[PDB]
Design a protein around this ligand. Sequence first.
Ligand SMILES: *[C@@H]1O[C@H](CO)[C@@H](O)[C@H](O)[C@H]1NC(C)=O
Ligand SMILES: *[C@@H]1O[C@H](CO)[C@@H](O)[C@H](O)[C@H]1NC(C)=O
Lengths: 399, 395
Amino acid sequence: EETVPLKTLECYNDYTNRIICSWADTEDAQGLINMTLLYHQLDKIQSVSCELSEKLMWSECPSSHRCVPRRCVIPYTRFSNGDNDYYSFQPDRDLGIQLMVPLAQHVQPPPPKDIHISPSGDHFLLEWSVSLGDSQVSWLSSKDIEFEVAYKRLQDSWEDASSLHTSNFQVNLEPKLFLPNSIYAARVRTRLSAGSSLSGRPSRWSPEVHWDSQPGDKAQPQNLQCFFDGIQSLHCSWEVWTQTTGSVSFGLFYRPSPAAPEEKCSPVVKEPQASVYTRYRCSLPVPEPSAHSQYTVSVKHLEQGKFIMSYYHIQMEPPILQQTANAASYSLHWETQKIPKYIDHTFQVQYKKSKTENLGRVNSMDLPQLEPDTSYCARVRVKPISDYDGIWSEWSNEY
Amino acid sequence: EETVPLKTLECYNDYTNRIICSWADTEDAQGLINMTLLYHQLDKIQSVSCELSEKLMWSECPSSHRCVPRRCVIPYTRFSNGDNDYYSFQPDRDLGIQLMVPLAQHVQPPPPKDIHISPSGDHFLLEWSVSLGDSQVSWLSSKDIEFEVAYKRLQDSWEDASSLHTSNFQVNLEPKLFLPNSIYAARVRTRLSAGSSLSGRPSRWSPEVHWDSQPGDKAQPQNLQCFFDGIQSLHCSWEVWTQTTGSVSFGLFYRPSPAAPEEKCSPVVKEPQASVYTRYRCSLPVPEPSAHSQYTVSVKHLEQGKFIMSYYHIQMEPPILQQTANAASYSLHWETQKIPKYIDHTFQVQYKKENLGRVNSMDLPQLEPDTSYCARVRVKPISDYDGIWSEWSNE
Ligand SMILES: *[C@@H]1O[C@H](CO)[C@@H](O)[C@H](O)[C@H]1NC(C)=O
Ligand SMILES: *[C@@H]1O[C@H](CO)[C@@H](O)[C@H](O)[C@H]1NC(C)=O
């Protein structure tokens, strides 16, 4: 803990009259403060007139710093064997600071600790402990002490968070104080009674405690918060559970007064977001704020749909197959039909053992020849065409 | 942004009797919400009955998602060229949310902005603006608005920060609201005057803005503060300018009542701490605190110095020479005198790169090649008195 100039001191007597001393100060520090040397002989005080060499005569500056050299001579007409020398350092300007601290108005109580989060039931049990030692009466007790607990959900900063005050050493937390599907954090600090004489800083913030809020519907949007900027705009925000947003789309509808036609807010903005909840905000103009105006705002699901008509057609059909080679096997026939009656067909056939041909709307088609192996295989389909559209029917019977 | 069921919906038809449709919901959603499919016709609406499919018949799943297909059939005998087929998805539950907001009581004023940090010679000016609109009567103007500024040192957390309340669009920040050479930050928000009928939330914070406070001694330590933990202890903390600790040590002292003798509080603990400052802390005890007990705490410079006496000495010690190279080569003379006379002397001569007595002359064996030079000596005390070996002489 030794200061620089004192370690850099060696002072050696020349024995005629004088004493010569060599010391140093740091080279960043000479700018901030200068030092004067004190020579102590019985009662004298006596500040030493100092000068600065280019190098420490008798010592080495600590190599971390680089040093500033000093060379001082103290003329001493007479020594003795009993002369007694002490060299001390002090600053040339009297610096230091002093504070009056009335104990009453400077009390900062001890923090709470041993802090446990437990559910007992529908409720949530926040507990803490505080060490006042003893005596039971020493300067503070159950009075004048009180407590402040702050809870918030993780994504929130503490700066804005709700707060409770109990003289009790535990507080019961129930929902409606909480947004269902999120992680919450709580911490306690010890506060002085507003209702007491004693003044000062609140206790250190306790360590945090984390827990998951009661479960919730998850499909439903939550956190509907709408606020008015006092000039012709109202800003509403809400949260939906992220996994829902593929299933449902939401939008925000307002009516001024519970009379006016419902009106749709745009735009709706999507906060990015990686969180388990996804936040949404929309700002709606409010052009004629009445004195007492009650806007009524709701989050309803947007509409999702399409026209399919038809124009869209599938069906399906069987051939009857009366042979496999080694004989005269003529044509093929398709039974059902499922008879459409309005609209054209363009039936399709295939054969052998990817080999096909295109056809008209004909209840049967003729085969050129096969011979060895077996008449097999041949399959059919039907695709509505011309006026009407659709998709090929699933394949039939055989292979 | 269209839901995965609307993307995945393909209804296709077999004109005889029924229609069949294929669609999906997100994998994730499966535990969460049951969607239903609606067949829109004319007057009817009529929710489709659907069941779960192994695969999506006519559609690929949306590129991002993975999905869970449904297959739905509907018994429709009657058709037409004019027929209008519309299918729409909706959750089966009534799920949705409705909130009334009387404007008067939920108001979040426009935040401060275009905020400037302004120094004067002595004071500190703090500027901003607020956009309040027109007509000059809209619902709030000079009132029901108020203000709150927080300022803190760059190193502090805003959680603990000093706050101020004005009705005005600027403030003059007295120094002595501010520690000396150091860097402060500040922000402002708009609030509602207590007098207001309007209720709401204080506005968002204006942006932070940064400046460095009045210059100061800097050799002096600032920011002494002490707290009484209400049982038997008082905790103090102070800063110094870090590169001062090379020149000076400080310590913490206390007087319970001024009349009382100064005690030195120990140990003094130093925080590292990364900055231009270095923070120190020390906690000192208490007696029974008197109800009004007044304590006095000071940081002074700790005593710094070391003893010498003599018991330390140094000197210089000339020889004269008889000659060099081939005339008389033995002994040497010493001078000066320079008379200590109280103490042992033990001068020492060397040619070799030899401890001698209080004697002022040495003799040597010699050689007589070459030339005698160079020959050195030294002067010091042993026994009762002591010092550093003197510098060699004239050689
Ligand atoms: C040290 O002394 C010189 C003149 O003797 C002066 O210019 C300088 O400012 C002093 N240093 C400090 C830190 O005051
Ligand atoms: C709605 O979803 C639940 C999920 O638990 C499912 O069991 C139920 O069958 C669905 N509703 C109907 C009417 O099938």
